[PDB]
Symmetry: D2
Subunit: 403 residues, 4 copies
């Protein structure tokens, strides 16, 4: 039954990932190294998160927290073998502490382990030793990273690393060095855990065991907007080598009938980061980016060197999108009169016309509520400096079509 068949449809089952350890390790010094804008105050980011999480449960939406998913999953000796088998090598940990680290973890509670598998494993967290203690000399005298296992403070944006796309999902070959260790854990979930091992569903593209090279795909850039149409933001973090490959997979399994490729200006971002549906016929938009997007339609045609053909659409993205859906016009609330500045994109839809956005985009939020949209609010004090919104912070596994 699993499958996201639109963006605005009714949401039922979403993954998400509260902040936590991974972030506790952050540090002005390590911020960028670690790929996270600003050191947040973890305790309250967790409160605020679960908070957002609740306003979603209180609507009868099944919220899965990666953290549980991971904790359950590794209660299966085989899966756990599976993660560790890949997550502790002479190449990532170092040959001098592969057995040390492994056994330590293997020797912790189901919960304290999932924590570390996400938030990471400092040398400190290990019992005295020769080796653990050369890594402490390293971080100490010269200030090297003391990470056996590196934190993934970006797990908390679950949107990015996998995509439910109709009756199936992609395991995403991430852009930046750090996040690539994300896609693995989530694979192990989809792969072992009892709500999926049983699930009927295909894996469109991806595999944490291959090396994907220049091919990267990030959830943000993927939009299954129904009618068998997939939006893909291409250019910045998701690439032609990657896209065109999903394109053909989707096509070669009657998942989707046409992808529409959103070419994103470089001269960092994600589609949904500048384009966000709220209602059947309405989208939040970051002007200055969108008005410079260049559309291209991939389509199944047996007379292509690949089974695909590609047009340059003749209309603006908004026009092309407008049609693809069976519409003529797209209601547009552009952000990016005005009290102050906010960016109100990257909102998530719980249902046709129901949106969760930030407690701070006050101007945008009354326009949204002026276009007849109900806005659930959550707090952007900390989750906000992570540059992520509601849409970034969720991963739809189950969402209805809009006929």
């Amino acid at each position: 039954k699993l499958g996201v068949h639109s963006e605005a449809g009714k949401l039922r089952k979403v993954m998400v990932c509260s902040p936590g350890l991974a972030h506790q390790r952050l540090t002005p010094s390590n911020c960028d190294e670690l790929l996270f804008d600003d050191v947040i105050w973890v305790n309250q980011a967790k409160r605020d998160h679960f908070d957002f999480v609740t306003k979603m449960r209180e609507r009868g939406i099944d919220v899965l927290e990666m953290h549980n998913l991971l904790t359950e999953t590794i209660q299966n000796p085989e899966a756990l073998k599976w993660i560790l088998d890949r997550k502790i090598t002479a190449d990532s940990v170092g040959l001098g502490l592969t057995s040390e680290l492994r056994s330590w973890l293997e020797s912790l509670e189901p919960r304290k382990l999932a924590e570390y598998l996400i938030g990471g494993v400092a040398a400190d967290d290990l019992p005295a030793s020769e080796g653990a203690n050369i890594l402490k000399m390293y971080r100490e005298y010269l200030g090297h990273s003391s990470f056996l296992l590196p934190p993934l403070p970006n797990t908390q944006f679950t949107r990015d690393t996998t995509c439910w796309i109709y009756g199936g999902v992609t395991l995403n070959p991430m852009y930046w060095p750090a996040r690539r260790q994300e896609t693995l854990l989530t694979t192990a979930i989809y792969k072992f855990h009892p709500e999926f091992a049983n699930a009927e569903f295909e894996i469109w593209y991806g595999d944490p065991d291959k090396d994907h090279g220049s091919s990267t795909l990030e959830g943000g850039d993927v939009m299954p907007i129904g009618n068998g149409v997939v939006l893909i933001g291409m250019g910045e973090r998701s690439s032609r080598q990657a896209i065109g490959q999903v394109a053909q997979s989707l096509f070669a399994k009657g998942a989707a009938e046409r992808v529409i490729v959103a070419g994103l200006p470089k001269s960092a971002m994600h589609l949904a980061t500048v384009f966000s549906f709220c209602d059947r016929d309405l989208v939040t938009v970051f002007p200055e980016v969108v008005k410079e997007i260049v559309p291209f339609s991939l389509r199944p045609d047996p007379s292509s060197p690949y089974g695909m053909n590609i047009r340059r659409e003749e209309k603006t993205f908004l026009e092309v999108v407008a049609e693809s859906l069976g519409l003529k016009k797209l209601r547009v609330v552009e952000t990016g009169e005005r009290e102050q500045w906010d960016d109100g994109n990257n909102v998530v839809c719980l249902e046709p016309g129901v949106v969760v956005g930030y407690d701070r985009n006050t101007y945008t939020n009354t326009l949204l509520r002026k276009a007849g949209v109900e806005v659930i609010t959550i707090s952007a004090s900390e989750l906000g400096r992570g540059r992520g919104g509601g849409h970034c912070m969720t991963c739809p596994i189950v969402r209805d079509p809009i006929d």
Copy 2:
């Protein structure tokens, strides 16, 4: 032939080089930072300058192998070309619009010209008019993307850190920057296929263009066979511990070396051969603000431990540790970039041809004078273009045959 690197100062007999070309012709003040080069150069002059520096060495009895010649030569054996094309041209690298079109093209080129493109990349530009290539042309022009089917490798120039020769073997280096991994494939290719290397006897201590490697990153500039069964491996920005840890036990496992000295580099910018370079049996240059901040580690073999290695931390200054290691009372040292320095200059990264015989940059006139004072012959070449590459005689060389001392 018996290939090996048994020192930093020894008589140099065989060097690999690569001159600037199509790679650097492709540089622009806006594509040059993602391309991992520092500044646009006068390619046509850099060449004249590089052929100068290549010739100055050859004129001294030394074999100098041009990468481009070597590849161009390798590119002839269809087993080889195939062996490269199969791993360079694939969907993840090129995409499904282009592979055939691309390789089909590639293979239709004359050999020499194929290695040009192999080092310097290939834009849509260069491919024949095609549905496919135009999309890319129209992605570039319209959306500001890159036309790069195969991406230029302006850094090949820097054959030093793309592979090291540690005594009777070479390491296939897993590069730091996702930009330069593409490089290793080519050298390896040469080492495996080129008449000169295929028949030669030598080990492969560490590496494989066919395995990922993750956090293990080893760059050659960081590696120093200083003779006396010791290896100095700088551990800083480019060379991680996972790689060093391994290249270590592979060296020990075959009595290639006795002692590895991890040069602990503070926070992570440049190679070790960049603040610290050799000159004579007993002379070294030193970026003092950095050298003086290293923390030396002695990493020896041990049957007494699981991983047959033991690692102790050393209280003497790095210079001292190195002294001890060469059986030496202590090193004569000339510092580079406050006294009667007429103007600022960085003298390091000079290459030895042989003890007391060295190549550095013309412009570094204050340092190169000391070098002379301390009794070294200093041969110069033009910094004007080569040096704006942020790299000197050392970085630009990858020794293959160099005699030990004494």
Copy 3:
């Protein structure tokens, strides 16, 4: 009790402060680049945060005076307003085509508003339809220009930097950056006209909004009258030896101070009080990484010297020298950046052993309590994305000898 700050830990009687305003509402990601601000903030939220802060000080006695507030009142004095306007409104600053228009509209202004804009600044869309403003409205939209006629001063928020008080007297600081120079004009015209300041006794040690100072900068964060005739100034950063030399010299000449300790800081690119702050008579927090690098120097008078003083190097740690400087045996130091990273420097002393900090710094704030210190907290979430803490967000005017 005359106006004067005579310690750092001592009893806090009168401080000045400035809450997030119009200047912050103007921040958009594309310009807080160049207005010396790290992020764009919820402004409504920040005001709350700042008020809370305020109350928490006031509800304990402190005479808290708010810039906007004092400036509003100041303006009501026609002579004062002209003073300000003759200077903020030039042809070098606003421009030939817009000096009349923009001044004339400003005086049409109701005071609470007029001042709202002095700190917050004027863009060309607060202006009456006009030809001259339109080429601006024009410049900014087509050629992506700074449309601002008067620059927004988000930083006035940090009242400690624009002026210090040093025992009986005040320095009006020649800010470093250009994003901030403007700031002092306003504070100067307050001390100068405002009723409250205009009449009582105090000295001007250093500085003049009128004068072009050159490579002389001095930022308040860098000048701590620790009391006991001693004055530490942190030099090398925002605060240059060209000012410091002179502050010191006037301080000796008017005998505000017996000794100036230059806490020469290692160049980088961070005031002194963002790395080393007082919690108690014998207590400081301390960003150990930066502190352990400071090289102290001692300035003293010298009746017989040319320049009225004679500086010499201090052999013990900076910290040891401060210590022996207030005649303590040893300063208890607490460091700051075990369960997540923490920076809790920059707490302000409301009295000996009572400070204001941020709620996010629980580790450090924990130690501080253990140090015999009671810690009032306020919310960082927005106030602390600023760049500042209790110590930045306050300019003490009246604080007791310790």
Copy 4:
């Protein structure tokens, strides 16, 4: 005895260049950022390329003046020296501790060198031994602080910038970066005392080292006197409307020129940097930015307060410029087959004859295609200065064309 620049293309007659000097020697990788230079160049070799340049003009009958010679000639007149020093050396720049020593030192020096140091700076080291200087070396090493009593001015090599000639008047410009206002002083003085100047005729439309010019910042490179009372002036990030407007309102009111076309630059260059003349109707541009600039015609008007009107244009800048030179349209070569180069910033020794960089083979060829003789200087060093011949020159006397 009269001077001026009545075009860009006319027979050049008098140019002021400045050869890379002691200041370039002072450049270190970790300092050349705050000095505002883009690379530590090889001085001796910049020095020889620059001369080569100097000579190559000197041979086509041009009279070149070096800023080092002229500064020299100047400061031998004691009053011009007193005149500079009293401004160059103050307690706000050299610091009370040193003015005395520092000034009494230079005065002891011979011309050739004393000038040398002005353009070059002077660090503690250079000072004769003294308690004063060492406490500066003290800071330098121990603390990383500058120890420059006087600032190095390695940008002096770019004379186009500091002073403009426009039709028998000249602007002594208020430079953008603090790190460069120090030149204006020096050139100003030469023009004010040196017999080659103090005696000729010409006005001073805009400029005074003395005044503080708020946001009014103007640079030569943004200013082109093209011919019949048309002055191009790019208003961007370097040249500010605050001046631009004064500079016009001075030009008109004095008969000097009949229109300014403000060349509106996108955010973040000099005009002469993306747009340059090689002949009566021949220019090189840089399409990324030339294509996207919004001109403005600025002309005099009796029927208005500030006595000017600005109409925006809809025609492209290139077009605007053509219609004001009275030409059908503009012949255009675009730069910025083999490899990338920006062939721009070429300077005209006469109409159709120009000096560019030798590296730029490609553009040189199009230019040669277009009927320009292209005399070339090396780029290996002077090129890392980011500027070309246009940059490296100060048209003092140049013939009109219409």
